[PDB]
């Protein structure tokens, strides 16, 4: 429109209908100039990397991008509490995104002092990768998302991508992408940008915990009409004896379904005053290999974090680890991080730090005793049932399913909704503004630009579909609740210095339903 | 429109339809003040020139101009690869040009420090020479075109022209052109400029290499019904003998068509550790004379660069020479330049460094032996066929056919499409903004102006018509392909410092068709 | 239709309308099995060739082809005489082609005796290269055309083609064509094949001889209003004198047009009892070079064979040479061949065995005498006029213009009509009939086939457009006529052994018109 007219209003609210909840969040953003308007080839050689497992090749772009792939970007703690305490499931339906109130500033430094002024004629470029023609980086748990607290002003993360690499070198199959080779809208201070997105059909997330275990689905009062081998020797003559499988021996009863797959993780205890044989963080970790590179199995298949009563143990890399407010980047203590756990899925999923089971490994005879072997990793078998990893308030929402010939249960392993066509990447960049050029023609590209940055507001609205609970359970359910006991600060609030903090990870599985 | 509203969006994409491909490219430009708003007479005396062959007379104008007469200004390397690997020919059809997001800046210097601010009321003037009333400088391979990389910001080249000269002096027939004597649109920051152009009908460029040679078009299994003189002496009595021309002697068979014209070039070898008799760059070069001035025959008629297996040789000035990224201007080594070759046209065109053939020079008799002479230059003859010079990704696209009474095959010798009415010149200039004038009237023209420069975006869209291939060839064709082998950088990409480079010239002739 | 019903009738006649003549010719053909149903790579190595100029690479196909690219295939001698004596020009208009009365025979050999029987169920495959996707071999004066005498039964020539070669080896750009990769009609004994073709617009062939010479177009009674330099020295003072160019000095008169191009040929005399300095057939011949291979300039540009009264001389390779009936293939005497001549075009074209003219080679002065040099080869110049090579009764009719970017006056140098889309190649092959296969499966391709050949009739009808003469010449014209004087045999008739012979080549240029 014009310089003196706002291009949008501040929309931040949650609307709770019967089977739907609509979340709207608005944030103020700041966008600097990245790479001084240049594309730069990057690799482990440029960053000084040495290990083969961490070698990479890619490019850093002068473009930023908007990321809102975390639940706290849309749900307040109270809204999250309502959702998890009142619904058996939820899933995103549609998306509305807006950019408005664009403000481009120029920075001039004379001597140790910088002056900031408006540049009303400068432009900011925004486009969406609706055709998914660029590498998708929103499927990784990267920082730079919209802040959970609406009053926080955030910096737009720089967009970068990786391609095929051989050490620090590239190959002929490696791809280079120029983001200026895409049509993009150019916005001055009076312009705004908006688009709508429809989520593809995804299953409802399981925001419930099973009230029954897979091995306890039988009637505890009635025998089965099936027999099991109860005795082999009479007291070395072979005397086979069979007995009815009933309530007194539930472990041997016939069952129609079995627990889901497993990929065993090393067990680590958080208890203080403990000794360790050696440094086993990398050496003792479960991993998978691709083209000679070892990658940590993290978080891996959805498995129960620990057995009943063993909350002190957690899988080495089988759980999401969040950092508390103010936590450092490198080598922080256990009390500075928040270790999530998936104990709710112990009713259907195997324990992460235990073998799946035992399998016969020979043919027993009068000369050879029957032998069994531990199954540390078990693939998918017919009749298996399992629960996917729970999602969290500060955890990811969705991920892009890789474009491959085949996949199985493409639920993101870090939690969330897997989609072939997720919300498109939204890329933003400040248009370069050259400084005064020389009065004589020079064919070289200009490298002198006016120092600029941009700021504005961003709004994203997502409609969520709800799956209401119809339980006939008589006794009250477990519910997420704040603790009344006095404390120096209110949980999920600001401190005396105005710092917002999330004191604990919040799952979604508090209500119960039968298996 | 207004100060705070963008006057255009960033359009940069390629759309591939069945028989048509539409290329759109957008770039950011910077325009300084040229000649301090003055017209200046220029000549070899003003530049210090001494040689008669390089003497000139002309004028330098305060106007800039937009040039997009190179293929890489519109085709990405991948689009170029698709075009050359999937089409037998192509030609431009229509043009769309846009100027928008005009930003005029003022520069003020206090003491060793410059401050840049917007001048919202200043104007930039743009007009197109649709009537071709000004000297056409886009027909020369000049620098200053739109960069191949969309992210590069480029400086608008200054417009200049030459007229008739006698040494460093002019004649009465010399013409002086004032570009302010043309109607031009004046644009503030809110205005935009656009026009459309239709290419005149031109033949499709030959993006194929012949799979047959002109001297091997006969049936290799059947004799001709024609005879040739096979013997003259019986072993000095004259005994004429005649024989059937057949597969065993293909060189003497009658043929309906002959190779095209030639203008022999000196042969230069790129092999290291070679000796030269003397400095023959100018003395040994082929040249043509006009009004007592010698001009290098460069690149001259389209001829085969070298014979089969002689890739080390190139004509002295018969091939286009491109410079690698970062190559200097004067006296660079051979490894700093890219020498193009036209070996694909060896099937119809004579070798550039060889004579066209031999012609009889006397009447043989019992006293005089038959004599022949080498034909170093051969003009057009009836029955001649030839292929024009190939075009390249970084090479020129079109040229203006000189307005003369007669011409023959007006295909530009540097490669491309010859047109009587090519895309018009687009001239741009910053309107002078006088400084504070004196409070007392002075009749002299003002010479104190506010230091200004302008910047903005430029978009050009060209629709290309495609000629699909309908070959019945069984074996696979030759195709342009990247090499998979590992390298420090990806070809046609940016370096670790963000520098875009084109590692090799890319022709168009990979597919094959019969002759 | 059926075995016992003819699929076509014998049509052989000429119909003379006012401005059109329709020629129909029917012949009986025989088609054997070529290459034993195989495709074979051929080269100068396979044929034992050694010279670089005769090196080639190509393939021989099991397919035959129909060729009617000679005038005597359609015109009887009487029809040719009428055409040449009554018309100033002619050109083909449309074509009708038919194959019918297919008869496939099987040959069985027991011991030194062969038995031939019908194979009613076998098929013959025919298709036309209407899209010109195969190498065109009809543009060379190859044998195997329809016989001039309707009663002669002819053998279908085998189809072969050449591709790019380096010595006896091929390159990646070389193409291999499989003719079974084309849709073709399969014909049993009851089936027939036919198609129609329309000739593209071509100029009328010049079947006239000019009654005026290019240097004698002025009025012999009136002076010009132009002056020429008549004297330089007064008897070494320079005294320029000028005179009117008039009838007394026609050589110095100004002229608007000049004779056509030239490429000088060595002069050879047919007179007996003559001595030669050395063997100059190849060494003294005019030639053109392509990719290091020398090809004889044959027949080269259309030039006058000899000066007036010098019929004994002929250019070394500038004239078509036909062989008399029964003439051998290698090293035959002059009386066994028929040397054509182009003396009719001496009025506009330069003599083949003479220089085009003289050109100044220096600047005359008081110290240096004026110097001139002979022009042995002269390219096209503005104002040039020329006549193309005459066509003959036994000579070629048309040729395919090579698909190239440029050509000049694409009239075939051997004579005839040049067309981008000439009559398509008609390819025919006997379908292989395997012998008894083994009773156990073998994956190798079958190599045991029933010996077969096919025979039938072929009819081609061509409509020719005529250009009637409207001369006002008073005296009778020169006409082609038979000689009444008694002879043992009638010219253009059969001998006592039934052998048909053509005793002389017949041109088309007997009538006259002004220049």
According to the annotation, is B282 in a ligand binding site? Answer: yes
Rg of chain B taking only CA atoms, in angstroms: 28
Tell me how far apart the alpha carbons of residues C126 and B512 are, in angstroms, rounded to a whole number. Answer: 26
According to the annotation, is C294 in a ligand binding site? Answer: no
Q: Say whether C412 and B257 touch across the interface (CB within 8 A).
A: yes
Q: Which two tokens stand for residue C461?
A: 């009808």
Tell me how far apart the alpha carbons of residues A91 and A76 are, in angstroms, rounded to a whole number. Answer: 17
Q: Which residue of B has its CA nearest to C355?
A: B361
Q: Which residues of chain B lie closer than 8 angstroms to A174, CB-CB?
A: 490
Q: What is the phi/psi pair of residue A133, to 5°?
A: -90, -5
The kind and range of the H/E element at C77 are helix C77-86
Tell me how far apart the alpha carbons of residues C303 and C287 are, in angstroms, rounded to a whole number. Answer: 16
**Can you list the pairs that B173-179 forms with residues at least 24 positions away whose Cβ atoms lie under 8 Å?**
B174/B57, B176/B59, B177/B59, B177/B133, B177/B134, B177/B135, B178/B39, B179/B61, B179/B63, B179/B134, B179/B427, B179/B429
Please report where in the chains the tokens 């005459």 appear, as a residue. C390
Q: What is the phi/psi pair of residue A54, to 5°?
A: -110, 10
Minimal CA–CA distance to B243: which of B227, B231, B232? Answer: B227
Which residues are within 8 A (CB) of C188 and not within 5 positions of it... i.e. 6 or more apart? C102, C104, C120, C121, C122, C123
Which residues are within 8 A (CB) of C479 and not within 5 positions of it... i.e. 6 or more apart? C85, C510
The minimum CA-CA distance between A294 and chain B, rounded to whole Å, is 21
**Beta-carbon contacts below 8 Å between B and C:** 400
Tell me how far apart the alpha carbons of residues A422 and A424 are, in angstroms, rounded to a whole number. Answer: 6
Q: Which of B24, B34, B153, B481 to mutate to test the interface with A (most CBs of A within 10 A)?
A: B153
Q: Measured in whole angstroms, how far is the alpha carbon of residue A104 from the centre of its chain?
A: 33
Tell me how far apart the alpha carbons of residues C468 and C513 are, in angstroms, rounded to a whole number. Answer: 12
Tell me how far apart the alpha carbons of residues B254 and C298 are, in angstroms, rounded to a whole number. Answer: 5
Q: What is the phi/psi pair of residue B429, to 5°?
A: -155, 145
SS3 content of chain C, % helix, strand, coil (to 5): 5, 35, 60
Q: Measured in whole angstroms, how far is the alpha carbon of residue C401 from the centre of its chain?
A: 13
Q: Which residues of chain C lie closer than 8 angstroms to B355, CB-CB?
A: 289
Q: Say whether B36 and A439 touch across the interface (CB within 8 A).
A: yes
Strand-strand pairing, B417-419 and B398-400: parallel
Q: Which of C141, C317, C328, C381 to mutate to test the interface with B (most CBs of B within 10 A)?
A: C141
Minimal CA–CA distance to C70: which of C462, C484, C483? Answer: C462
Cβ of B219 under 8 Å from any chain C Cβ? Answer: yes
Q: Which residue of A has its CA nearest to B103?
A: A121
Tell me how far apart the alpha carbons of residues A298 and A389 are, in angstroms, rounded to a whole number. Answer: 12
Minimal CA–CA distance to B215: which of C264, C291, C286? Answer: C291
Q: Measured in whole angstroms, how far is the alpha carbon of residue A269 from the centre of its chain?
A: 24
Q: Measured in whole angstroms, how far is the alpha carbon of residue A455 from the centre of its chain?
A: 28
Tell me how far apart the alpha carbons of residues B406 and C383 are, in angstroms, rounded to a whole number. Answer: 12
Half-sphere exposure of A147 (CA within 13 A, CB side): 17
Q: Which of B228, B258, B349, B381 to mutate to test the interface with C (most CBs of C within 10 A)?
A: B381
CB atoms within 10 A of CB A487: 10
- The strand pairing partners of B298, in sequence order, are none
| Chains B and A make contact, 3+ CB pairs within 8 Å | yes
Q: Measured in whole angstroms, how far is the alpha carbon of residue C382 from the centre of its chain?
A: 28
Touching subunits for chain B (3+ Cβ pairs under 8 A): A, C
**DSSP code, position A318:** S
Q: Which residue of A has its CA nearest to B33?
A: A439
Tell me how far apart the alpha carbons of residues A209 and A480 are, in angstroms, rounded to a whole number. Answer: 13
Longest Cα separation, chain A: 107
Q: For the stretch A15-25, what's the b/e string if a residue is b when 16 or more beta carbons lie within 10 angstroms of its beta carbon? A: eeeeeebbbbb
User: DSSP for B413-427?
Assistant: TTSSEEESS-SPPEE
Residue C104, SS3 per DSSP: strand
Which residues are within 8 A (CB) of B204 and not within 5 positions of it... i.e. 6 or more apart? B88, B89, B90, B91, B465, B467
- The strand pairing partners of B85, in sequence order, are none
The minimum CA-CA distance between B88 and chain C, rounded to whole Å, is 12
Q: What is the phi/psi pair of residue C117, to 5°?
A: -140, 160
Please report where in the chains the tokens 């060839």 appear, as a residue. B473
Q: For the stretch C48-61, what's the b/e string if a residue is b when 16 or more beta carbons lie within 10 angstroms of its beta carbon? A: ebeeebbbbbbbbb
Cβ of B91 under 8 Å from any chain C Cβ? Answer: no
Please report where in the chains the tokens 């750009």 appear, as a residue. C173
Q: Measured in whole angstroms, how far is the alpha carbon of residue A275 from the centre of its chain?
A: 32
According to the annotation, is B101 in a ligand binding site? Answer: no
Q: How far apart are the first and last CA of chain C?
A: 57
- The strand pairing partners of B295, in sequence order, are B288
- Which residues 447-506 of chain C have a CB within 8 Å of chain B? none
The kind and range of the H/E element at A27 are strand A20-31
Which residues are within 8 A (CB) of A131 and not within 5 positions of it... i.e. 6 or more apart? none
- Of A41, A110, A189, nearest to B493 by CB-CB distance is A41
Tell me how far apart the alpha carbons of residues B22 and B77 are, in angstroms, rounded to a whole number. Answer: 15
On whether the CB atoms of residues C137 and C69 are closer than 8 A, the answer is no
Q: Which of A4, A36, A41, A102 to mutate to test the interface with B (most CBs of B within 10 A)?
A: A41
The kind and range of the H/E element at A220 are none
- The strand pairing partners of A419, in sequence order, are A400
Q: Which of B1, B6, B31, B67 to mutate to test the interface with A (most CBs of A within 10 A)?
A: B6
User: DSSP for A400-441?
Assistant: EPP--S--SS---TTSSEEESS-SPPEEEEEPP-B-PPPSS-
Cα C470 to Cα B315, B360, C345, C473: the distances in Å are 55, 41, 21, 9
- The strand pairing partners of B16, in sequence order, are B21
On whether the CB atoms of residues C31 and C124 are closer than 8 A, the answer is yes
Strand-strand pairing, C57-66 and C158-163: antiparallel
On whether the CB atoms of residues C458 and C27 are closer than 8 A, the answer is yes
Which residues are within 8 A (CB) of A115 and not within 5 positions of it... i.e. 6 or more apart? A107, A108, A109
Cα C139 to Cα B214, C145, C392: the distances in Å are 12, 12, 16
Q: Say whether A436 and B451 touch across the interface (CB within 8 A).
A: yes
**Can you list the pairs that B178-185 forms with residues at least 24 positions away whose Cβ atoms lie under 8 Å?**
B178/B39, B179/B61, B179/B63, B179/B134, B179/B427, B179/B429, B182/B127, B182/B129, B182/B133, B183/B127, B184/B125, B184/B126, B184/B127, B184/B427, B185/B125, B185/B126, B185/B127
Q: What is the phi/psi pair of residue C344, to 5°?
A: -65, -25
Tell me how far apart the alpha carbons of residues C37 and C63 are, in angstroms, rounded to a whole number. Answer: 8
Residue C312, SS3 per DSSP: coil
Q: What is the phi/psi pair of residue A379, to 5°?
A: -80, 180
Q: Which two tokens stand for residue C226?
A: 């132009």
Q: Say whether A186 and B10 touch across the interface (CB within 8 A).
A: yes
Longest Cα separation, chain B: 107
Tell me how far apart the alpha carbons of residues B496 and B498 are, in angstroms, rounded to a whole number. Answer: 6
Q: Say whether A186 and B151 touch across the interface (CB within 8 A).
A: no
- Of C160, C292, C374, nearest to B219 by CB-CB distance is C160
Half-sphere exposure of A303 (CA within 13 A, CB side): 31
Name the E strands within A329-376: 337-339, 357-360, 372-375
Tell me how far apart the alpha carbons of residues B201 and B419 are, in angstroms, rounded to a whole number. Answer: 8
∠ Cα B452 B454 B460 (to 5°):
160
Please report where in the chains the tokens 């029987």 appear, as a residue. C117
Q: Which two tokens stand for residue B471?
A: 């070959």
Q: Which residue of B has its CA nearest to C316?
A: B229
On whether the CB atoms of residues A111 and A463 are closer than 8 A, the answer is no
Q: Which two tokens stand for residue A188?
A: 């001055």
Q: For the stretch B378-391, what's the b/e string if a residue is b when 16 or more beta carbons lie within 10 angstroms of its beta carbon? A: bbbbbbbbbbbbbb
Q: Which of B1, B24, B30, B502 to mutate to test the interface with A (most CBs of A within 10 A)?
A: B30
Residue C269, SS3 per DSSP: strand
Q: Which two tokens stand for residue C39?
A: 């495709």
Alpha helices in B6-153 (DSSP H): 77-86
Half-sphere exposure of B492 (CA within 13 A, CB side): 25
- The strand pairing partners of C193, in sequence order, are C99
Please report where in the chains the tokens 């034993």 appear, as a residue. C36
According to the annotation, is A344 in a ligand binding site? Answer: yes
Q: Is the dihedral of CA A322, A325, A328, A334 positive or negative?
A: negative
The minimum CA-CA distance between C292 and chain B, rounded to whole Å, is 6
**DSSP code, position A82:** H
Q: Say whether B189 and A3 touch across the interface (CB within 8 A).
A: no
Residue C57, SS3 per DSSP: strand
Name the E strands within A79-216: 87-109, 114-118, 124-128, 153-155, 158-163, 165-166, 169-170, 185-187, 193-198, 205-206, 208-210
- Of C267, C274, C278, nearest to B369 by CB-CB distance is C278
Minimal CA–CA distance to A96: which of A490, A508, A381, A464? Answer: A464
- Which residues 35-74 of chain B have a CB within 8 Å of chain A? 36
Experimental method: cryo-EM
Q: Say whether A172 and B488 touch across the interface (CB within 8 A).
A: no
Minimal CA–CA distance to B460: which of B96, B91, B198, B73? Answer: B96
CB atoms within 10 A of CB B405: 5
**DSSP code, position B445:** P
Touching subunits for chain A (3+ Cβ pairs under 8 A): B
CB atoms within 10 A of CB A480: 15
Backbone conformation region of residue A37, classed left if phi is above 0, alpha if psi is from -120 to 50, else beta: left
Q: Say whether C402 and B217 touch across the interface (CB within 8 A).
A: yes
On whether the CB atoms of residues B339 and B311 are closer than 8 A, the answer is no
| Burial (CB count <10 Å: 0-12, 13-18, 19+), residue A95 | middle
Touching subunits for chain C (3+ Cβ pairs under 8 A): B
Q: How far apart are the first and last CA of chain A?
A: 57
Rg of chain C taking only CA atoms, in angstroms: 28
- Which residues 239-278 of chain B have a CB within 8 Å of chain C? 240-244, 246-261
User: DSSP for B242-263?
Assistant: EEE--TT--TTS--S-EE--EE
Q: Measured in whole angstroms, how far is the alpha carbon of residue A255 from the centre of its chain?
A: 34
On whether the CB atoms of residues C162 and B220 are closer than 8 A, the answer is yes
| Burial (CB count <10 Å: 0-12, 13-18, 19+), residue A275 | exposed
As for chain C, the residues directly before each break of C–N over 2.5 Å are: 235
Q: Say whether A186 and B457 touch across the interface (CB within 8 A).
A: yes
Cβ of B376 under 8 Å from any chain C Cβ? Answer: no
Tell me how far apart the alpha carbons of residues C184 and C453 are, in angstroms, rounded to a whole number. Answer: 18
Minimal CA–CA distance to B190: which of B21, B32, B325, B7? Answer: B7
On whether the CB atoms of residues C161 and B220 are closer than 8 A, the answer is yes
User: DSSP for B316-338?
Assistant: SSSS-EEEPTT--SSS--GGGEE
Tell me how far apart the alpha carbons of residues B192 and A141 are, in angstroms, rounded to a whole number. Answer: 43
Tell me how far apart the alpha carbons of residues B353 and B346 are, in angstroms, rounded to a whole number. Answer: 12
Cis peptide before B299 (omega within 30 of 0): yes
Which residues are within 8 A (CB) of C364 and not within 5 positions of it... i.e. 6 or more apart? C370, C371
CB atoms within 10 A of CB C383: 9
Q: What is the phi/psi pair of residue B384, to 5°?
A: -75, 145
Tell me how far apart the alpha carbons of residues C291 and B349 are, in angstroms, rounded to a whole number. Answer: 8
Cβ of C325 under 8 Å from any chain B Cβ? Answer: no
On whether the CB atoms of residues A49 and A474 are closer than 8 A, the answer is no
Q: For the stretch A402-412, what's the b/e string if a residue is b when 16 or more beta carbons lie within 10 angstroms of its beta carbon? A: eeeeeeeeebb
Residue B39, SS3 per DSSP: coil
Residue C294, SS3 per DSSP: strand
Q: Measured in whole angstroms, how far is the alpha carbon of residue C53 from the centre of its chain?
A: 22
Tell me how far apart the alpha carbons of residues B217 and C137 are, in angstroms, rounded to a whole number. Answer: 6
- Which residues 342-371 of chain B have a CB within 8 Å of chain C? 346-348, 350-351, 354-361, 363-371
Name the E strands within C324-451: 337-339, 357-360, 372-375, 377-378, 384-385, 398-400, 406-407, 417-419, 426-430
Q: Which residues of chain B lie closer than 8 angstroms to A178, CB-CB?
A: 76, 149-151
Cis peptide before B364 (omega within 30 of 0): no
């Amino acid at each position: 429109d014009g310089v003196g007219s706002s291009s949008g209003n501040w929309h931040c609210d949650s609307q709770w209908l019967g089977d739907r909840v609509i979340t709207t969040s608005t944030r103020t953003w700041a966008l600097p100039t990245y790479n001084n308007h240049l594309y730069k080839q990057i690799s482990n050689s440029t960053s000084g990397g040495s290990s083969n497992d961490n070698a990479y090749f890619g490019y850093s772009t002068p473009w930023g991008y908007f990321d809102f792939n975390r639940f706290h970007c849309h749900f307040s703690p109270r809204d999250w509490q309502r959702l998890i305490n009142n619904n058996w499931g939820f899933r995103p339906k549609r998306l509305n995104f807006k950019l408005f109130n664009i403000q481009v500033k120029e920075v001039t430094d004379n001597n140790g002092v910088k002056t900031i002024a408006n540049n009303l004629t400068s432009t900011v470029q925004v486009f969406t990768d609706s055709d998914y023609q660029l590498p998708y980086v929103l499927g990784s748990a990267h920082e730079g998302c919209l802040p959970p607290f609406p009053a926080d002003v955030f910096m737009i993360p720089q967009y970068g991508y990786l391609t095929l690499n051989d050490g620090s070198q590239a190959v002929g199959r490696s791809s280079f992408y120029c983001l200026e080779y895409f049509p993009s809208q150019m916005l001055r201070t009076g312009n705004n940008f908006q688009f709508s997105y429809e989520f593809e059909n995804v299953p409802f997330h399981s925001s419930y915990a099973h009230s029954q275990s897979l091995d306890r689905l039988m009637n505890p009062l009635i025998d089965q009409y099936l027999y099991y081998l109860s005795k082999t020797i009479n007291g070395n003559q072979q005397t086979l004896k069979f007995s009815v499988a009933g309530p007194s021996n539930m472990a041997v009863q016939g069952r129609n379904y079995i627990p889901g797959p497993s990929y065993r993780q090393q067990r680590v205890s958080t208890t203080v005053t403990q000794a360790a044989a050696s440094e086993f963080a990398w050496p003792g970790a479960s991993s998978w290999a691709l083209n000679g590179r070892n990658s940590l199995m993290n978080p891996g298949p959805a498995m129960a974090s620990h057995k009943e009563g063993e909350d002190r143990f957690f899988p080495l890399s089988g759980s999401l680890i969040f950092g508390k407010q103010g936590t450092g980047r490198d080598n922080v203590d256990a009390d500075k991080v928040m270790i999530t756990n998936e104990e709710e899925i112990k009713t259907t999923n195997p324990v992460a730090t235990e073998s799946y089971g035992q399998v016969a490994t020979n043919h027993q005879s009068a000369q050879a005793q029957a032998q069994t072997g531990w199954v540390q990793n078990q693939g998918i078998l017919p009749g298996m049932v399992w629960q996917d990893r729970d999602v969290y308030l500060q955890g990811p929402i969705w991920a892009k399913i890789p474009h491959t010939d085949g996949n199985f249960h493409p639920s993101p392993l870090m939690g969330g909704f897997g989609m072939k066509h997720p919300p498109p990447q939204i890329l933003i960049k400040n248009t370069p503004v050259p400084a005064d050029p020389p009065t004589a023609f020079n064919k070289d590209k200009l490298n002198s630009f006016i120092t600029q940055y941009s700021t504005g507001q961003v709004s994203v609205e997502i409609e969520w579909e709800l799956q209401k609970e119809n339980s006939k359970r008589w006794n009250p359910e477990i519910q997420y609740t704040s603790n009344y006991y006095k404390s120096n600060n209110v949980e999920f609030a600001v401190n005396t210095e105005g710092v917002y903090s999330e004191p604990r990870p919040i799952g979604t599985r508090y209500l119960t339903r039968n298996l």
